[PDB]
Amino acid sequence: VDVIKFKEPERCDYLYVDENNKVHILLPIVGGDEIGLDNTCQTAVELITFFYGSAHSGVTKYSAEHQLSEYKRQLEEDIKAINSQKKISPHAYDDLLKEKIERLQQIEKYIELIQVLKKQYDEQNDIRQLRTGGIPQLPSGVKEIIKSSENAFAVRLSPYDNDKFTRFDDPLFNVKRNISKYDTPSRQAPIPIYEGLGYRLRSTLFPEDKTPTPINKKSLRDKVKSTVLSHYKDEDRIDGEKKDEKLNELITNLQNELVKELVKSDPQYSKLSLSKDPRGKEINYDYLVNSLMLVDNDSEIGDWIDTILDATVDSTVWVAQASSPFYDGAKEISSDRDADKISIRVQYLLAEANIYCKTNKLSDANFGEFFDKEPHATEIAKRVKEGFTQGADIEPIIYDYINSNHAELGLKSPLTGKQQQEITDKFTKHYNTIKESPHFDEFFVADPDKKGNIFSHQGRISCHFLDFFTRQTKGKHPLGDLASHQEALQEGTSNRLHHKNEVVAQGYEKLDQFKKEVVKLLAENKPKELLDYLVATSPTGVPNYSMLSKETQNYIAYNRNWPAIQKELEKATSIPESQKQDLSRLLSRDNLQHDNLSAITWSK
Amino acid sequence: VINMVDVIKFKEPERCDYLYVDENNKVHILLPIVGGDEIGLDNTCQTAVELITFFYGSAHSGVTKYSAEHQLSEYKRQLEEDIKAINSQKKISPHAYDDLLKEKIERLQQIEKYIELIQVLKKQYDEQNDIRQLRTGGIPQLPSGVKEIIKSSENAFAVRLSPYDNDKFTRFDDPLFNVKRNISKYDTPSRQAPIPIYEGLGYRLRSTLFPEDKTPTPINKKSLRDKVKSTVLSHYKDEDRIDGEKKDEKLNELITNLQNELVKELVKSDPQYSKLSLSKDPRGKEINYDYLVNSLMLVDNDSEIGDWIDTILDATVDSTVWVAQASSPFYDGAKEISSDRDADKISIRVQYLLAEANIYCKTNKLSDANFGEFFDKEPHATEIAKRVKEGFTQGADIEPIIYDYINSNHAELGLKSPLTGKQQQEITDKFTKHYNTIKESPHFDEFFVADPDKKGNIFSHQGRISCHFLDFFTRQTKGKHPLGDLASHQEALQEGTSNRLHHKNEVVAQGYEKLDQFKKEVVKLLAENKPKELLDYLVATSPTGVPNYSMLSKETQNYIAYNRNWPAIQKELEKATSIPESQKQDLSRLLSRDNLQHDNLSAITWSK
Ligand SMILES: [Mg+2]
Numbered sequence A: 001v002d003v004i005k006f007k008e009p010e011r012c013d014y015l016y017v018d019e020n021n022k023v024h025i026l027l028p029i030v031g032g033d034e035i036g037l038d039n040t041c042q043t044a045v046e047l048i049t050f051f052y053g054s055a056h057s058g059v060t061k062y063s064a065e066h067q068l069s070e071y072k073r074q075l076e077e078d079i080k081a082i083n084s085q086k087k088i089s090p091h092a093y094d095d096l097l098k099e100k101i102e103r104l105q106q107i108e109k110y111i112e113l114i115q116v117l118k119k120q121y122d123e124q125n126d127i128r129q130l131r132t133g134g135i136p137q138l139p140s141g142v143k144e145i146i147k148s149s150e151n152a153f154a155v156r157l158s159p160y161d162n163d164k165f166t167r168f169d170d171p172l173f174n175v176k177r178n179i180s181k182y183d184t185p186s187r188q189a190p191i192p193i194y195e196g197l198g199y200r201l202r203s204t205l206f207p208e209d210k211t212p213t214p215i216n217k218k219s220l221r222d223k224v225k226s227t228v229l230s231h232y233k234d235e236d237r238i239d240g241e242k243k244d245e246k247l248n249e250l251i252t253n254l255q256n257e258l259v260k261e262l263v264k265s266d267p268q269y270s271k272l273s274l275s276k277d278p279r280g281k282e283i284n285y286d287y288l289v290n291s292l293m294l295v296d297n298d299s300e301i302g303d304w305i306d307t308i309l310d311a312t313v314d315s316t317v318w319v320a321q322a323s324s325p326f327y328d329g330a331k332e333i334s335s336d337r338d339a340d341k342i343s344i345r346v347q348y349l350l351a352e353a354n355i356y357c358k359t360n361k362l363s364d365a366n367f368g369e370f371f372d373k374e375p376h377a378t379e380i381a382k383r384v385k386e387g388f389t390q391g392a393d394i395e396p397i398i399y400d401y402i403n404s405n406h407a408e409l410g411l412k413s414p415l416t417g418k419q420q421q422e423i424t425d426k427f428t429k430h431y432n433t434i435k436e437s438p439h440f441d442e443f444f445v446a447d448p449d450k451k452g453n454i455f456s457h458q459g460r461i462s463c464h465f466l467d468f469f470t471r472q473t474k475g476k477h478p479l480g481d482l483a484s485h486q487e488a489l490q491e492g493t494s495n496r497l498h499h500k501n502e503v504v505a506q507g508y509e510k511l512d513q514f515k516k517e518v519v520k521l522l523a524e525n526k527p528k529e530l531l532d533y534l535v536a537t538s539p540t541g542v543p544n545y546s547m548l549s550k551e552t553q554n555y556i557a558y559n560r561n562w563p564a565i566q567k568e569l570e571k572a573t574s575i576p577e578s579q580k581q582d583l584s585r586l587l588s589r590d591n592l593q594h595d596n597l598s599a600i601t602w603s604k
Numbered sequence B: 001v002i003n004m005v006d007v008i009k010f011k012e013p014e015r016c017d018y019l020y021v022d023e024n025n026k027v028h029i030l031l032p033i034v035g036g037d038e039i040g041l042d043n044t045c046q047t048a049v050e051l052i053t054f055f056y057g058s059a060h061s062g063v064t065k066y067s068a069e070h071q072l073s074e075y076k077r078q079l080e081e082d083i084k085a086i087n088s089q090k091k092i093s094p095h096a097y098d099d100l101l102k103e104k105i106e107r108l109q110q111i112e113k114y115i116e117l118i119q120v121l122k123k124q125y126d127e128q129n130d131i132r133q134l135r136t137g138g139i140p141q142l143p144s145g146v147k148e149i150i151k152s153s154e155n156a157f158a159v160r161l162s163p164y165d166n167d168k169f170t171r172f173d174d175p176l177f178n179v180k181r182n183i184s185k186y187d188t189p190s191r192q193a194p195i196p197i198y199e200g201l202g203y204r205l206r207s208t209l210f211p212e213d214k215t216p217t218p219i220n221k222k223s224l225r226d227k228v229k230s231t232v233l234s235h236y237k238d239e240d241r242i243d244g245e246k247k248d249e250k251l252n253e254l255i256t257n258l259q260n261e262l263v264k265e266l267v268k269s270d271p272q273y274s275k276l277s278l279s280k281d282p283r284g285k286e287i288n289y290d291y292l293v294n295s296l297m298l299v300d301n302d303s304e305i306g307d308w309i310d311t312i313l314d315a316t317v318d319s320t321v322w323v324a325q326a327s328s329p330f331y332d333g334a335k336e337i338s339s340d341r342d343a344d345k346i347s348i349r350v351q352y353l354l355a356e357a358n359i360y361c362k363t364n365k366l367s368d369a370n371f372g373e374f375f376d377k378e379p380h381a382t383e384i385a386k387r388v389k390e391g392f393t394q395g396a397d398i399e400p401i402i403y404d405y406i407n408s409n410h411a412e413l414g415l416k417s418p419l420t421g422k423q424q425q426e427i428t429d430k431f432t433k434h435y436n437t438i439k440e441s442p443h444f445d446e447f448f449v450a451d452p453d454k455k456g457n458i459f460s461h462q463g464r465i466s467c468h469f470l471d472f473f474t475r476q477t478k479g480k481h482p483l484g485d486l487a488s489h490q491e492a493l494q495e496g497t498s499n500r501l502h503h504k505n506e507v508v509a510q511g512y513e514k515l516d517q518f519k520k521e522v523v524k525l526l527a528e529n530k531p532k533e534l535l536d537y538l539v540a541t542s543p544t545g546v547p548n549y550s551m552l553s554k555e556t557q558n559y560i561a562y563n564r565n566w567p568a569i570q571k572e573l574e575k576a577t578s579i580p581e582s583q584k585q586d587l588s589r590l591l592s593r594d595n596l597q598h599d600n601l602s603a604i605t606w607s608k
């Protein structure tokens, strides 16, 4: 069957091809996008798979070397298939061919580099250990990349039952920890320390006397209703000779309280009003009591509030933001496990705020060091405890405490409301991502929208393989043709790399676009244009007719107006002799050296 | 004032409230029923709000919203300004913007009719004050024409539920799903408290979930991991150990039982996990006694079985396995049901799930039955409430308890066949999305739910759930006012691919984009120095037959007329084989300065 089936896929594990067709291999540190999903004992998993392959959920994952070798094979099949057309068309697929050869040569080189790294430059067993080590460690080359990153940072926290086997040793945020159960003879329970942030959060939120902490979280509507009702008494009524005036005071107070509470989340609500119905009708006694017949002189202030709200406010208004991880539906903190959970949350917020400041160049301090100290450890725990009882927003309690201390945290200036909302959104997203982690000791957090040495690619947080290779080889194996490739990846728009390679895919779409142009220019019977199209050259100077294949050759040769096309060819003057004779072979059945190009296909 | 600048600023926006222009440039006005996409955000007393605004405008959050009539009149004005601007170029170029002009005029003429139809609907055909009452005299009703559209719909349905504190002012009167309700507080002298009926689904759910003796119902929801742990641990005892002769054999049974249980439970969500194995770590190393105890040093003789389990899981399973589904609305973090209000909340969820299952069957033509009628009846009301109660105390998934109860009674619910697992998961996903959308409603009495992915007379547009204004107009005027040129517009919208209408109008937008592309072609064809192509391009026509040079404006006329190539261009235009007299003459007026009748076209601009 005379069809070329192109095999080069548009996606391969660990491989990013940039717009300039430079091939980059991304060494993975841990799995994830911005926050790492692997930690503690499993930190090494990605690296194990990269260097050695592995079995995940009884489905085999192959090494980078295996996968790159397979991609090489496919490129060679593609190249050999293109070359088979050269006896028919000397210029067949010239751009696609060169781009494929360019990638093949780079990939071979990367295969060589991985090989020499494992064979020659692992005398300390730093990579081998991934495979033999009881609980493996990050190779030092990766530890150094981490240490020098400007855009990715580990944080270390204090869960009650801490795991000794943390694997990120340069965290930005770091707090005191219990003695892991694994550093006790029987390995069963941690040995608690009685100082620092972790302890103060746990001991305060669920105390040794077992007194629960109530969580009194109110929806917006409930929060506004009750607040307003607080300045009233159970016996209060909208009755009397002062009823209209009392209804007015209620309307105004409820309006003030609804607005004030709405405005913090969206100041569009600054202009919301409760004095009137959508249809313009005035919210007064006669309307609600004698016309709508909903409340009366004997109604409670709460039932007047309900009625005011239902008659004047749009349902849109009551739609909640996303929830804070701090409020997950629980009525109370009623067990050491609940307290530990919430302690971790607080700590993780403070770690996100620390990352935020570090990555935006506002501070290099370790916020943990400060919050572990007294009275801060204690004060922050009490204000958070009080927050849950008020049903208040937890994040601003942390931000106000940071801001009342900004200089001591290394910050020239307090955090603005806008910077606060950005931290909250990262914290919320990142936390929701890792909240079913079996261990909260540690996370690595990367921002691929900033300049640096760490990247996001195919669900892995990664660095450039060449960064790693150079560090681990100490400069002793120069990179030849790949010496500028690491620098080239920095020059891209973003550290967030696309999961597929568009430059590979476009090498197929261009062959499809060429077919469309040809089918159109023939259906439109404009033969001079067809010839100009074919002879028109791409940026590299290659003629479009390079992209002929069985289908396009047959459309042209057997078309209606081929005689018309052939007249133009002979009588053209501007088309060089090379290409007249070339097109004539290809498109004229009468040509001595006429032959059929193969069909071409691929997987989309 | 004479800071006049020779530039046409097009005013027609690409978006206008209530207005959808289809790919054939037919204008459609969408009459809104309630706000929302699939599930209506308005209900009970506020049901009429969209209609209030459509016909009369209204003030919301102290921002004015204008009537359809006002907004279409403004759009008409903008269209006329664009038409007059285009026309002013005609003395310079007879064919200036011929396609855009025509498209704009077409839209204008249709928009004027719709403006006329609304006016006449209000002046002539509101004798019973059906539209008027939106503005007046009590909590307004949907107008009868909208109710009939609702009654007729194949793709949208109201559902009516039983909250403890019910609001009598429901406003959807043909619900698919409907259950018995308390006597609203508003049907009592003092207006303060409902009168509870003590029969039906609602009652049984509330009374069962938090009983009159005030005993809490524990909600024992576990993580997948905790659920697997505790289960496996149930087959064990506090003093069971992995020692000491037979340790290796006992370790192996734990692995198997843990593996079977992890798999049994994961497979229910993704059968890619059928082949998961706890038998070796990622690097192929065997999970045995010597490895966890002597080498890694993580557990020993005396460790509890629960700690062996932790260690097995931690050494074998990837963090991804533990990533839970989005939650069910049923499990919202609470440890128990411990107040009438908690029970009322959960009762409404159960009810709303059953209403979705009902909508799904109706929508896919599997049943016309009212599921509420069946679930209000004993023993069904009681039994389904008990099974949901047991479910919560087990930490079981609530949705399948409902589906299995439905399937054990499928015939009686008008179903040929039980609901398949796939159909079950489609119901759960709609229920989850829709419930989450309305879960802060002040009233749960009723909701209108539309599926704009199905064939029917209800649509989604601009965050409104809507019907075609012509559907309404025809019904409300009882056929007496012929639609004239719009007589096929309603059918045309049916012929479209989806009832989910795009919020802006691409046909309007593309009328600007085509002037931009024309510019690019021109700037390319000149920089590449290809004179015959440029001429060819200019002289080539769109589908309507209009030549591309209709799209010249100051910028492109000047690019051509003062380019290097111009004498080269002019020469080609004269050797002139292909081009008809009339067009040779135009292009020459337009592009040659020596031409007697040479004049400058205006620049053109628009807001993106
Ligand atoms: Mg461990």
Ligand SMILES: [Mg+2]
Residues within 6 Å of the ligand: A310, B044, B045, B167, B169
């Ligand atoms: Mg009401």
